[model samples]
Each structure stands twice: as C-alpha cells, then as structure tokens.
Target: GTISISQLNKNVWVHTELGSFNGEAVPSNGLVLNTSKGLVLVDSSWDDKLTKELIEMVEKKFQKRVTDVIITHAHADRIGGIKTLKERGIKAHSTALTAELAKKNGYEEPLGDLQTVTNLKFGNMKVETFYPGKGHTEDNIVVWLPQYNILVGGDLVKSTSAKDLGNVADAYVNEWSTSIENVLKRYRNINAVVPGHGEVGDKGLLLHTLDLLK
Candidate 1:
C-alpha cells in the first residue's frame, strides 16, 4: 500500500499512510491542517512506526510541525499511533468520549487538548465534531474542515467497495442512517471525503453510506 498526501485547499491537506489491518495492509487515513498556528490531525493510525511516519511526512512536505492530533474516534486504527506523536512532542486532540474510549481500549490518558462535540476553531479553520448518531462504531465522530468544505469521516465512511465494515461490535445499527443524514446537512461545498480506509470521493459517498444502513 502507498500513502498519499494532497491539498484540500491552501490550509488543509489529506494524508493517507500505509499500514496493515487484520494481517492485510490497510492504508491509514488522516488530514493535516496546516493552520497558521501549527499542524493538527484527524487521527494518528495504527502502531508506533506508522504514526511516526505521519509526523515526519507533515514536517517534510508542509514544513510545519504537527502540533496536535485529533482522534476522530476511539478505534486503535484511528488513535493507535499516538505514542509516536508524543515522541515528537505533538499533543493529541479528541472529544472526551474519544479520550475515554482510547483509555478504555488500553491507550494512555493522552497528552493534549480534548474538545467536546461542538464547534472549535483552529487558526482560520472551523473544526467541528459530529456524533453522527451511529454506524461503524458507537463513538464514531466525523470531522468537518469548514474552511475547505471537506469531511474527514473517521470510519463512518469507507473508501471502496472491496472493503468490509469489519468489526461493528459496538455499531449502532438503528441510528446509523440518521447520523449520516446529519453529516449531509453540514457539508455543502464538500468536494471529497477522506474515509479512513479507502479512496476519497464526493458527497455521494456519504449519501450512499446512509443508504447502505437503510
């Protein structure tokens, strides 16, 4: 697998890193906000090395240090790389529920500012977290980069058809569609969605994901 980084706009970039999930290579996905203040992330991704590479990628490509990491959801594949971020002095960000879930899943208390589910701003970008009712996971929260009209859907949406939903042990089947509908209301200019595990695409993916649940 290959990790790719591309500009969403002047201030935001989508980053995909390569890693294995269930003995198969699963490209870890995230977004780097090159805000005026510093860099912020959507999620870290699996294990220490993959996470470290993420930090390195940002520094080398954008010439900005990743100052904070936002754990979009509690899944290890999402927040697993935090240990490496700390090694480079980058703090982590997340909703309280994300933090709690991280701890419950054996991750440490985490090292930075954790934002609750409301609108929070970083530099000129307006970042918000949505509960999305339910889907791949109960605590799944999709991120809105209002500055670029892009949605970093942790795992609430996946990139391709060959991919399976994987572990939905904590999935909220009943509210999944309602949650995706809520996402539809937020992203009007959204050009593509960075689904944690697949190719990025237009708003139709979100609508299709809702249909899948229905």
Candidate 2:
C-alpha cells in the first residue's frame, strides 16, 4: 500500500513506512520527506509503483510539486524510482562520485534526470553537500537545512536498531565513526533530522546515529 502524509505540523511531516527490503537480512527501511518550500525525498522505496503513489499523495496533500529529490547512494531501493521522479519534474542529486560509480558499475539509475548538487536553494530551504565521511557508503552526503535546523544525513549516519554495517555492496568501514563527529558539529539549533531510513527527530537522533557509527 502507498503511504500517505497523514499529519502535518508546520512544514514538517512524519512519514509512514511505505515498504521495506533486506539483503540477506540486512533490513533497510523505506522513507520520504516533505520540506518547507518543496518536497525532498530519500530512498524511493523499491519500485515505480510506490514512487507514483508517493507522488500522488504529496500532490494531493500539499498541492505543491516535489521540486528536488536526493538519492543518498547506489542501492536499488534508494534510486529505483527515478522514473517516477522524472515524470513529475523532481530532480535527483548525489555526490559526483556516487553518480559516476553507479553508471560505471552498470547500475541502471535515472542518472540522466538528476542534477548533482554542489549547492541548492528553494525559497528559504537550503541544502549543502556533506560528503561521505564514514559509516555508510562513500557517495553518501549529509544534507543541511538552515530553516528547520534539520540534517538529512543519508546513510552516513543512522538511527534506530538497524544494522551498523554497510550493505553487501560498499561502504567506508574505518572512517564511519569520525564522519558522524563531523556531522554532529553541523547540528546547532537543529530541530529534527531525516535519516535515510527512520523516524525524524531532534538532536538526540544525531547523537544516537553517531553512537551507532562508533
């Protein structure tokens, strides 16, 4: 079933679990986000059906289009919905290296529909690229939101009881802990954070995610 934006408080909305997947019991969750000026999403669940549903729900509830989308890394569940995003004019982004690696590895992503973000602005919302410093994948990024004091720390840091290890594909093992520290420093007046997979929360989630990396 398609998850809906059931509630809203200001510009922040608590996303529901649309679907999930596991790599030999890896168990990664699927989630999305609605920001202040426009909609910004992370993992696109696992296919186009879910993505289309997400698009319909957002347009119906917010009456605004999803202007931008950030695909954290190379996982299929993360980038699978590019077709849907493109159909709705949502531009996807990721670190340059990630995009390059994705194509180099013969992975089929809608990389053509994406626009790499050295930086971006949507009204009051701002997103700055924080390169992969540790835990998850090398192409991971920590997205900063000055307005909401929120950070979209891709898979570089994680919250919840999810596995502390990277997927069978790729990730930085040694530097993941130190990377979280880098992300923490960016947290100030931060109200909430949207991890690649998990509930949004305050500074506590940042601390908790960092701890997981350590």
Candidate 3:
C-alpha cells in the first residue's frame, strides 16, 4: 500500500496511491475534508490495501472517523475501493448516471441515493456537488467547498500539464468546454482547483482544459 498523504490547504488533504492507468504508472488521488463531524473522503483509492492505509492514516493523523464519501465519477481510479469502503460501512454518494455505469461495469457496491445536485453538511462546512455536464465521463461531477473556495474538478477539468483530454472513450468532446464554462460561472471565486490527476492549480486549470478541447 504505497499511499502518501499531503495537506492541500488548512483542513484539506490529498492521498495518492501508486497505480497504473493507460499502461502508465500513475497516482490515484483522493481528497479529504476535515470538519467538526468527522472526515469526508472525496474519492477512494485503487485497491483494498491502499484504501485501508488511507483510512488508518486519516484516523490516526486526524483523530476522526470517516463519516462519509462523495464519488465524483464512475472510473476505477475514483471508485475502485468501493468494496473496502463498504466493508467499513462508510456511506458514499454518487450521481445516478455514475451508479448506473458502475453497475453496468459489474461494480456492485452500494451507493447512497443518486442525485444531480446535492448539498452536504459536515459540521459547519457546506459542500456542494453538481453535474456540470460531461467530460471524461457522462456521470462525472464536481465538488465545491464554498467556505474554502476550493473546487474539486474530478476529471471534468484537466491539469495544467494535461496535453489533451486524457480519456475520452465515454466523453462528450463537443460539450466538454461548455461544461467547464458552467463550472467557471458557478464557482467564480475558486482559489484552488484540484483536478482528478496532476498538480492542483487555480482557474488556469479550467482555461487549460478548455484549450485542450479546442
């Protein structure tokens, strides 16, 4: 379980697990949000070992239980550890489309009710999840932490280093830019943007993704 954790902001942390995708070694990233209630995990790791280590690291370091999780997309890199999360009885939320796709692909983990837009409360923090249209996957969604002005773009927005839309087997190339434009309009004050992979940045990620679509 080669899991490494790093603090992205005050109460935000990111965990990376070594994994291979597209026949290349990559880091499967997940986000953590610390709140009064407990910790909310944005995504799960690539396997059971890494996922367990992620839980241990969070509980030991933060001294809080993982209260819930938000699965931003249906990709294995994002939801592959559903079995581990289910073993721990952790509740996770995902969009209907994501759940459907996951099930169609033989992922049987139980997910909370599917929703296009949902508002979550972790103590005093307000986290909003929305389907900003499609890119990467039809069910991909973004998470917004208004209090911190942080936008978790999942795979909807690409990293600054992203040469092009990495995976488009299930993507909508024509509407990808429009989806990003909606994100830009919705979270205008985003201070930090965390993509599904690669380094985090500001609004530049959105612009870069739009450029890639061009």
Per-model TM-score versus the true fold: 0.88, 0.77, 0.93
For model 3, residues 1-214, the per-residue Cα lDDT tens digits are: 4677788776888777777558866876668988899988888877666778788989888999987878888777778877778878888788878888878766655474646678888898788898999877887889988888888888888888889787688899888889999999898977889888878889999999999998
Instruction: Name the regions of candidate 3 deviating beyond 4 angstroms.
Output: 21-24, 110-114
- Model 1 off-target regions past 4 Å? 21-23, 111-116, 160-163
Candidate 3 yields a Cα-based lDDT of 0.82
TM-score of 2: 0.77
lDDT of each: 0.75, 0.61, 0.82
What ranges in model 2 sit over 4 Å off?
Answer: 6-9, 20-38, 104-117, 166-169
Which candidate comes out best when scored by TM-score? Answer: 3
Per-residue error (Å), model 3, residue 146 = 0.4
Best-to-worst order by lDDT is: 3, 1, 2
- lDDT string for model 1 (1-214, tens) is 4556777778778788777657777676788888777888888877777777777777788787788777877777788887777676777776676677778888865643444356867777688776666677767788886656789887888565624556777977767777778888767778779887777887878876776676
lDDT of 3 at 207: 91
lDDT, model 2? 0.61
The residue-by-residue lDDT of candidate 2 on 1-214, one tens digit each, is 3374533346655444455445232223333445557776655645677667776776678777777776766665566677777677777776666677657655544453233334666655566656646457666666666665667665665666555544625666667767777777756677666666555566676677666656
